[PDB]
Structure formats: structure tokens, C-alpha cells
Amino acid sequence: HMKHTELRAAVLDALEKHDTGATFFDGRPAVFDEADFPAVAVYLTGAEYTGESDTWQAELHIEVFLPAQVPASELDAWMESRIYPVMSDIPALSDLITSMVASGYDYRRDDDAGLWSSADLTYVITYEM
Amino acid sequence: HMKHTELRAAVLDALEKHDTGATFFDGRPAVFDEADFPAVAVYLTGAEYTGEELDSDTWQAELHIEVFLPAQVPASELDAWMESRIYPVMSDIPALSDLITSMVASGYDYRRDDDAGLWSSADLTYVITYEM
Amino acid sequence: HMKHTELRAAVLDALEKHDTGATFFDGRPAVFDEADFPAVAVYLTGAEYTGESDTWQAELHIEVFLPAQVPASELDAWMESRIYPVMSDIPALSDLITSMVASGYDYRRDDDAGLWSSADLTYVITYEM
Amino acid sequence: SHMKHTELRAAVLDALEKHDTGATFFDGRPAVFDEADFPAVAVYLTGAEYTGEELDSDTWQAELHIEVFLPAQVPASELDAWMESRIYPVMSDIPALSDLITSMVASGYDYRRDDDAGLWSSADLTYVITYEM
Amino acid sequence: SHMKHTELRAAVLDALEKHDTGATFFDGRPAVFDEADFPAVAVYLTGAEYTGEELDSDTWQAELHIEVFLPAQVPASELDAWMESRIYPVMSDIPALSDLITSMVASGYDYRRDDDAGLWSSADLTYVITYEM
Amino acid sequence: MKHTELRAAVLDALEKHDTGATFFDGRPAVFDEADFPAVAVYLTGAEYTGEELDSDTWQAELHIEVFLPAQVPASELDAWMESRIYPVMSDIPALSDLITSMVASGYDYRRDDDAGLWSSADLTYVITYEM
């Protein structure tokens, strides 16, 4: 297919392999269903062409969702337990990109509805389409 | 007749010739109809005169080729439509190149319907230069 | 009257003498009568004092409105055959200003009710109050 | 015995009112508008701020507004017509305003609207002035 | 035993309450008022931050506000009058405030209104101050 | 990961000190009229800053926010900080052990823009640490 699908699939596959207690999403969902939590979504944002070469740059997210009123440690625990480790070595993803560096780690919330709470892990990557 | 119409047109023709399963739009649409999905919109944003350093009719705009589908679909659905129906056509469109002076990939953004959450899309953008 | 009334009046007169199809408005309106369509408005934005003789600057807008249903080409077509031709030479306007240059061409919508759809042609002009 | 800002706006309202009192004059920009106050004129200041900082001086700088309000459906020419007649001309020679400031220069002329409801329409004439408190 | 911020706002509030007794005061910026209470005066801080890192100092910096509130439609000069006969005379000389800070300079004078309701209008006088916790 | 150990070290040290507050791990959005006084410890802006030839260095903003009803005088918030929060932040070995540096940042007074149900003082420090 095109590069973006491969990228998310490589991350989604590795994350799905071990952990077996979460609903995975390809792209960042808008609404949820109780049965979806714990939810984990892998997606891209800000993808853009770079050249002044065929290099593109994007922000890779792996976000964990849980019911609104849950303590930060719940999200962190899921992250430090079923995600962060996987992200250390993913040969599949590696073969598809030219580079990857840690970026941020944000705690987010359901802006209006207030139905969910989350932890968004982000890496900056560069690749060829 | 005006340069913009010729521009949109060329891309729309090349696109709707290769395929025939999508509903094509000339300009970005606000409201959508389930029946229209998968929809493809071709339009321009930010067109401005750039030659005040003396360059005749030298404008610059952002060319959009955005694909639409229902809000629920995964990012792959969109990418799949892009990769199979759009992206290829885009590599070679003589009709187009003969109208502009330059074109370079810009962005690829995943957008959604913030207003009602009815659709989801992938906006492919290019930066072009051309004489009016 | 101040230079602004003369500026707008000149464009309006030249536009209505060349093509009678539209319904001209002096200044940008918000509410529109479904009948007004096709509507055309001539107006100024960003009028500011520039210096040393009282040099000013402003953005001249010539925005044509049509119903939302309409595809972009219908807007482009109106411009190409009824507005643009005219803008190339308006001696009355030329006598009022010191300089004009093309600026932008934007497609705008009605965000409050979504009843109309437009194309907004803009030039930058310098003149003396 | 009055605050500088008051004396400043007052000198302006005094001059404008000498040529017309058919309009309803405001001291400050009105938030809500009463259809019966049309036509209305508002004199006010925005951005007032101490400037003598760096050079060590008791100089303030602010923006002086003189805005004309009319019903929303009116053509831009009508707003200008009121300005050319009773306002713009008065602005070039208000001695009482001079004796209060240290400098004045034209800044802008903007056409504004009632974004919230849509009851009024306007033209706002602004100057940048400097003065001491 | 008392935080610096409390001492700062208290030096001003006491001076104001002392200058003219019986008036309405607020320690922090309120959002709702009661007709009777007007004119209300509020003294508060915003933007307080530690600024001694790039140079190894104990300095903090914050914007000191003394804002006067009145009904939403009063002419702006009414707000200025309170400032002129209550606030400025006091701010001109407050030893207790001086003893608590290291510097103070005039900053701005803004006219603000009730955005969520439109029940009041105000005049916010601000000073930039630096001090030590 | 650090984050949990970071907020824990701070939360723990604060609870041993005073017992009259409802502590939250992370910034809450809706409170119960009975959770006041509330204290929340959380992080924002955590971002990667590079490798120190030994590990990955990060930077985040550490928040300690005390919440009280909307009408309380600003003095009530300050007094709560002065007596129950500052004395603790002055020295928390468990925390000092987890980070590579800490410096005071700001002290903001915040409000419940939506319902006007509360008032707060948000104390923040900029910290650096290895993940």
C-alpha cells in the first residue's frame, strides 16, 4: 500500500502481539464505548514533505484511553507495562523509516463530553512515501 | 476559462477517468450525504499574487485533493483509497503541468467533521505556482 | 466625501456599467436576500495611515456571492467574464489612488447559516485621504 | 481636577457636540446597543500603557477611538457620510485636545459590525496619542 | 509566616480600605457582583513567576492589578473618577507595599467588561513588580 | 516509568504532613462539593531532551494545585500553600533522588471558567529527569 498504512500496521502488530486486553484503533477515534476501554490507538499527525529529497516528517502517536475520572498512574501503568517496552525494538517499523526520536508524553482529556482520559506517547519520524 | 477552473478541472478529469466509484466535488463541501461516500473534493486555498518583485500573474496556491468517508472508518480505509485511486494519477497529469509553473508535495493530513462528526477525511496538499 | 466613498463608488459604477446581472452592494453585508443572488460587494478592509500628503493603504475587495449549491467554477466564471476584465482598467479609480497591485483570491463560505458561497478578489491600494 | 483620560475624551466630545447633538454620544464603547440611540457616536481609549520605561519618562501611549454606529443594513457610504460631515473634519483642529497630549497621528479607519447579534454597523476612526498622566 | 503574595495584596487593601472606609473590597478577581456593593475594588496578582535562573537570583515578577467595577453601562469617566479620588492618591505612596518589594513601575490602564453576562464594566490599573518570596 | 514515581514521591510527602485534604493523582476535572480542600499533583509538557551518553533526559512541568470554593479570598489559598505545601517542597529526598534538577517556575491563581464552583493556586516547578 502506501507508507502510512505500513507504519501504523507495524506498530499496531507489535503492540497487539503481547498485550491481549485492549481494543486497538487505526487512527485517532472520536467517540468511545465502555467495552472499548482499555483503548489504544496508533496514528499520525502533521505529516509533511521535506526537501530543499523525498523525505517526509510526521508525529507518531500511541495513545491510551480510559474512563474520565481515573488517576494518572492507571494510564502510566498501562503505558509502562504494555507499550513503552514494545517501542524499544520494532524491526518492522525500523525497516520502513529513516529515523525515530522520542518527543513528548502528554496527559489529555475528553475536551467537552468528559467521557475519557488519556496518555499520548509521541515520536517524531522521517520516512519516504 | 479562468486559470483556477482549468486547474481543478484537469485534476478532476484525470481522477474520474481512472475510476468511477467516487462522487467528485469542485470545491470543498460543508454538508455531506451518506450516499456520496466515498467522496473526493478538489480545491484551492490561499491563492495570492506573489510577484511584487516584478513577476507577471505569478500566483501561488495550495492544491487540495481530499478524500471523504464515514467517521468510523480506520485510517487505513482512507489511505487505501488514496493509494489506489489518487496518489498514482497525481504522479503524471500532463493536462495539469501544462497549466502551472511548479508543483511540490506539501502535506497529508487526517481531518474530521468537528461540527457534527459525520465524516472523516485525508487531505493531500500540493503547493503550485502559475500565471493567472 | 472622503476618499473611501469615491474609491468604492468608482469600482461599483464601472462594474455595473459593464455587466448588469448582479445586485451590487456598497460594503460587505451579512444577511442576504435569496433574490440578491448573484450579489457583488465592493468594500475596503485594513485602511491605515502610512506616513508623509496623507498616505494611506487598504485592501480592496470585490466579492461575488452565489448560493451554496454552486460549484467553484460558477464563481470563477462570473469573475472571468464580468469582473476581472473590468479591473484591468478603471481610469476613475486610477485618478483616485497612487498604486494598485493584485493580492489574493479566496473562496469563502457562510459559516453562520451556510446560505451562500463566494470568491473574494483583493488588491492592495495606496492613496491620500 | 479630573483624570487625564477623562479630560482627553471630554475635549473630543466637547468639539464634536459643538457641531451636532442629533446623535447620541457615548463616553467609552457601549457593550449593548439600544436601537433608539441611533445614530450614535462613541469616543474612547484602548491600549493605554506606560511608555517612559527605557528612556525613563512619565509618558503614556494609547489609542483614541471615535466610532459612528448605524443600523446594520446601511451602506458603507452612509457611515462615511456621517464621518465626513461631523467628525473627520473636527479632528484636525481641537486645541483643547492638544493642550492635553504630546503627540497625535492618524492610525486607522475600520468598518466594524455587531458580531454577537447583528443590530449595528460602524466605522471606527483611530489615532495613536502620547501623553503624560 | 505569611506568604509574600498575601502581604502584597494586604498592604494595598488596608491602605484602600483605610483611605475611605465603608467601601467594597476583594482579595482576588470576582466574577459576580451585587448592585449594592458597587463600586467594588479588587486587588490581585497575575503572571507571578520566578525569574532568577538565567542569572542566579531570588527574583520573582508579577502583574499587580487594582481594578474598579461599576454597572455595565456607566460612562467610562465614572470609572476614572473612582481611580482619581481613591486609587491613585493611595498608590502614589504606600510604604508598606514599598517595604515588601524590590521594584514597581506603572504598566497599563485598561477598560474591561463582563464577557459572560454583561452585568458590569471596569478599569484595571496594573503595575509590574519584582520581589522575593 | 518515572512519572508515577515522581507524583508518588510528592503525593506521599504531602499526605504524611497534613491530613485535612483530598489528594488527587493528576488534575481532576469535576469535584464533589465535599472534596474541598483538594490538592492535585500532576505533570504537563513532558518532553524528550536528548541522550546523556547514559540515558534519555526529559523535561516536564510539575504542578501542585490546591482547590477551594470559588468565593474564598486569595489569602486562603496562599495560607494553605505556605503552611502545608511549601514546607514539604523545601525538601523531599525521595523526589530529589528521581530527578536531575528542579527549579521554581510560577504560581498562578486559577478559576472554574465553566461552573464557577472553585478557585485555585497552581504551584509549578520545572524539572529535568531521565526516563
PDB file of N, CA and C in Angstrom, chain C residues 11 17 26 30 32-33 35 38 48 51 64 79 84-85 101 104 120 129:
ATOM      1  N   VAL C  11     -15.385  51.706  -8.463  1.00  0.00           N
ATOM      2  CA  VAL C  11     -15.375  50.301  -8.836  1.00  0.00           C
ATOM      3  C   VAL C  11     -16.795  49.849  -9.112  1.00  0.00           C
ATOM      4  N   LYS C  17     -21.801  49.058 -15.091  1.00  0.00           N
ATOM      5  CA  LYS C  17     -21.924  49.563 -16.459  1.00  0.00           C
ATOM      6  C   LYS C  17     -21.485  48.497 -17.461  1.00  0.00           C
ATOM      7  N   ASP C  26     -22.687  48.206  -1.603  1.00  0.00           N
ATOM      8  CA  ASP C  26     -21.591  49.093  -1.218  1.00  0.00           C
ATOM      9  C   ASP C  26     -21.223  48.686   0.201  1.00  0.00           C
ATOM     10  N   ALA C  30     -23.992  40.896   5.682  1.00  0.00           N
ATOM     11  CA  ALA C  30     -24.018  39.606   6.364  1.00  0.00           C
ATOM     12  C   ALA C  30     -25.276  38.874   5.919  1.00  0.00           C
ATOM     13  N   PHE C  32     -28.421  38.172   3.594  1.00  0.00           N
ATOM     14  CA  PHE C  32     -28.644  38.272   2.163  1.00  0.00           C
ATOM     15  C   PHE C  32     -30.053  37.822   1.807  1.00  0.00           C
ATOM     16  N   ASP C  33     -30.624  38.428   0.773  1.00  0.00           N
ATOM     17  CA  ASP C  33     -31.952  38.047   0.306  1.00  0.00           C
ATOM     18  C   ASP C  33     -31.706  37.057  -0.824  1.00  0.00           C
ATOM     19  N   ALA C  35     -32.922  36.569  -3.244  1.00  0.00           N
ATOM     20  CA  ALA C  35     -33.098  37.258  -4.514  1.00  0.00           C
ATOM     21  C   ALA C  35     -31.821  37.977  -4.926  1.00  0.00           C
ATOM     22  N   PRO C  38     -27.365  36.668  -8.165  1.00  0.00           N
ATOM     23  CA  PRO C  38     -25.955  36.800  -7.807  1.00  0.00           C
ATOM     24  C   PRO C  38     -25.693  38.181  -7.229  1.00  0.00           C
ATOM     25  N   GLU C  48      -5.301  51.954   6.691  1.00  0.00           N
ATOM     26  CA  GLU C  48      -4.382  52.528   7.675  1.00  0.00           C
ATOM     27  C   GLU C  48      -3.459  53.642   7.148  1.00  0.00           C
ATOM     28  N   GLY C  51       2.069  57.346   6.335  1.00  0.00           N
ATOM     29  CA  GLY C  51       3.138  58.312   6.517  1.00  0.00           C
ATOM     30  C   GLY C  51       3.058  59.635   5.776  1.00  0.00           C
ATOM     31  N   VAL C  64     -17.911  38.264  -5.069  1.00  0.00           N
ATOM     32  CA  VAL C  64     -19.158  37.858  -5.709  1.00  0.00           C
ATOM     33  C   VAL C  64     -19.779  36.704  -4.933  1.00  0.00           C
ATOM     34  N   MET C  79     -16.331  35.800 -12.307  1.00  0.00           N
ATOM     35  CA  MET C  79     -15.150  36.642 -12.229  1.00  0.00           C
ATOM     36  C   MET C  79     -14.504  36.822 -13.609  1.00  0.00           C
ATOM     37  N   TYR C  84     -13.075  40.584 -13.539  1.00  0.00           N
ATOM     38  CA  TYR C  84     -11.687  40.698 -13.987  1.00  0.00           C
ATOM     39  C   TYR C  84     -11.464  41.617 -15.176  1.00  0.00           C
ATOM     40  N   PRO C  85     -12.152  41.357 -16.307  1.00  0.00           N
ATOM     41  CA  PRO C  85     -11.978  42.210 -17.485  1.00  0.00           C
ATOM     42  C   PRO C  85     -11.960  43.678 -17.092  1.00  0.00           C
ATOM     43  N   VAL C 101      -2.150  46.766  -6.731  1.00  0.00           N
ATOM     44  CA  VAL C 101      -1.469  45.522  -7.053  1.00  0.00           C
ATOM     45  C   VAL C 101      -2.377  44.365  -6.657  1.00  0.00           C
ATOM     46  N   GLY C 104      -4.954  38.771  -3.443  1.00  0.00           N
ATOM     47  CA  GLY C 104      -5.404  37.413  -3.245  1.00  0.00           C
ATOM     48  C   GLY C 104      -6.712  37.100  -3.928  1.00  0.00           C
ATOM     49  N   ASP C 120     -13.592  35.893  -3.362  1.00  0.00           N
ATOM     50  CA  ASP C 120     -13.252  37.251  -2.966  1.00  0.00           C
ATOM     51  C   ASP C 120     -11.920  37.706  -3.573  1.00  0.00           C
ATOM     52  N   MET C 129      -5.777  60.464   1.886  1.00  0.00           N
ATOM     53  CA  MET C 129      -7.070  60.807   2.452  1.00  0.00           C
ATOM     54  C   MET C 129      -7.490  62.172   1.959  1.00  0.00           C
TER      55      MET C 129
END
